[PDB]
Amino acid sequence: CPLMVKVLDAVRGSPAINVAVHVFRKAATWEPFASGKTSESGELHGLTTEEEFVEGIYKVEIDTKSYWKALGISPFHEHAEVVFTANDSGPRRYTIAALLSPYSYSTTAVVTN
Amino acid sequence: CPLMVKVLDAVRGSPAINVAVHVFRKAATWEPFASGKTSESGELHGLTTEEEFVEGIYKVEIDTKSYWKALGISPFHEHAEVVFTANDSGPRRYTIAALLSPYSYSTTAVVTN
Amino acid sequence: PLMVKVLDAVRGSPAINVAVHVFRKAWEPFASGKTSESGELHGLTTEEEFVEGIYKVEIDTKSYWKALGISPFHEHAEVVFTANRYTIAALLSPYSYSTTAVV
Amino acid sequence: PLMVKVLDAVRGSPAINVAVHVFRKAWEPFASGKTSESGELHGLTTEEEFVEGIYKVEIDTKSYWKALGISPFHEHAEVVFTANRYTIAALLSPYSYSTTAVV
Numbered sequence: 325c326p327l328m329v330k331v332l333d334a335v336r337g338s339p340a341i342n343v344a345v346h347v348f349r350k351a352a353t354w355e356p357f358a359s360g361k362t363s364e365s366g367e368l369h370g371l372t373t374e375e376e377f378v379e380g381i382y383k384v385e386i387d388t389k390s391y392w393k394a395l396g397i398s399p400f401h402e403h404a405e406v407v408f409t410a411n412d413s414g415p416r417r418y419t420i421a422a423l424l425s426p427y428s429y430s431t432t433a434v435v436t437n
Numbered sequence: 438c439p440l441m442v443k444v445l446d447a448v449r450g451s452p453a454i455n456v457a458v459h460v461f462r463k464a465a466t467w468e469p470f471a472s473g474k475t476s477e478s479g480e481l482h483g484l485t486t487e488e489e490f491v492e493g494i495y496k497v498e499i500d501t502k503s504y505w506k507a508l509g510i511s512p513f514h515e516h517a518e519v520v521f522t523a524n525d526s527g528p529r530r531y532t533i534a535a536l537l538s539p540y541s542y543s544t545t546a547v548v549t550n
Numbered sequence: 551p552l553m554v555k556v557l558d559a560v561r562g563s564p565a566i567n568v569a570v571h572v573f574r575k576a577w578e579p580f581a582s583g584k585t586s587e588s589g590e591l592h593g594l595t596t597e598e599e600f601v602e603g604i605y606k607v608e609i610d611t612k613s614y615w616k617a618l619g620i621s622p623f624h625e626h627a628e629v630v631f632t633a634n635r636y637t638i639a640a641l642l643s644p645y646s647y648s649t650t651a652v653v
Numbered sequence: 654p655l656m657v658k659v660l661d662a663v664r665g666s667p668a669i670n671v672a673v674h675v676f677r678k679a680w681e682p683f684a685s686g687k688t689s690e691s692g693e694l695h696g697l698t699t700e701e702e703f704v705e706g707i708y709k710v711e712i713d714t715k716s717y718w719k720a721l722g723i724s725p726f727h728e729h730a731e732v733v734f735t736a737n738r739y740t741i742a743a744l745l746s747p748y749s750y751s752t753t754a755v756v
């Protein structure tokens with residue numbers, strides 16, 4: 325799946341591979357929810373399950389800093405942090421897509437069902 | 438596949454479904470090369486083949502105008518037109534991704550092999 | 551030393567009267583304001599105050615869209631960077647945003 | 654009536670000395686120039702000349718990246734719109750660009 329993240333690299337013209345993604349959910353403060361790394365295709369499947377993914381405000385943080393530093397590029401953003409309310413009118417499936425540059429990022433959401 | 442196009446809609450939070458995509462190749466003027474429509478997932482596979490996709494300058498035109506008009510939205514851009522040299526140092530596979538808004542578009546490329 | 555600009559990709563206009571909050575990591579509130587008629591927010595800080603460190607610029611996009619009658623995806627366009635004149639620009643759509651920094 | 658601005662997302666700077674060509678559909682060349690130190694190109698046209706119609710703004714991004722020693726994907730960031738003050742902004746990366754219009 326109900327939460328998928330896809331990341332692309334604007335500098336290299338590739339997927340952003342092995343980038344850390346942390347998801348938090350807003351507590352009664354940000355409580356850890358799930359995390360993972362992108363695959364060779366830039367995708368991260370299997371973050372969560374239908375049973376774990378409840379209504380709430382979620383924060384997806386993509387660790388852009390480590391990713392650029394590891395490629396020998398200077399990162400401006402510390403991380404790319406997408407915050408949204410999920411499932412408020414019923415369960416949906418979300419894809420969070422992000423395009424990364426050293427001084428910019430773009431992000432969109434696809435919401436289904 | 439060697440040329441794939443993926444389109445997303447920033448207004449509706451969905452794939453851009455059934456959007457016309459025309460590809461031209463620069464002639465000895467823009468000669469028609471291939472065209473198609475995006476699927477229910479926003480993707481257009483099967484534009485061309487390894488044997489047809491030669492070196493050249495290619496223009497991918499995404500018909501944003503028809504797409505917005507059909508949804509009852511006012512389009513500013515007539516079309517989103519990505520122009521690139523392909524295969525100059527050998528065959529590669531290209532994915533052209535585009536994110537559409539009425540007054541803006543973002544596009545990136547993923548290049549493999 | 552720090553300017554924020556916000557643009558609306560759906561209407562093709564500056565995003566007016568948008569709340570912008572800036573935090574510095576000790577998140578200490580650091581500066582805030584509302585966008586002008588041009589989509590720009592000047593006068594956030596001073597050179598004396600704006601020291602190197604890690605800043606978050608949080609733009610209240612949700613309130614913006616809701617005032618226009620459009621249901622938005624995000625709570626805010628939130629933007630986190632290490633410092634060390636900065637213009638932070640945000641381009642808004644209901645289900646998307648892009649941000650950049652020009653230094 | 655028509656301004657073009659170009660930003661570099663890799664270096665976090667204005668894109669300086671970039672060629673910009675504007676065409677009007679009869680493609681008739683209509684206006685052109687090079688970006689200034691601020692990444693902006695003013696003085697392209699006049700209110701008398703800038704009539705409603707379909708315009709292409711073509712930004713010579715390839716030459717820009719090549720001067721910096723970076724191999725670029727695109728030939729140009731080309732941008733096509735129906736008119737009817739316009740600022741057309743382009744944010745450049747080697748394998749990507751975003752463009753917007755603020756009217």
Ligand SMILES: O=C(O)c1ccc(-c2ccccc2)cc1
Nearest residue numbers: 330421422423430534535536543
């Ligand atoms: O693989 C995808 O579905 C995909 C990933 C990223 C994008 C994207 C394009 C431009 C800006 C931001 C994101 C589009 C499609």
Ligand SMILES: O=C(O)c1ccc(-c2ccccc2)cc1
Nearest residue numbers: 639641648649650742744751753
């Ligand atoms: O008017 C400006 O200064 C400006 C316009 C657009 C952007 C921009 C931001 C994100 C994506 C594309 C363009 C930045 C600055």
Ligand SMILES: [Ca+2]
Nearest residue numbers: 379411412413
């Ligand atoms: Ca609810």
Ligand SMILES: [Ca+2]
Nearest residue numbers: 492524525526
């Ligand atoms: Ca060759």
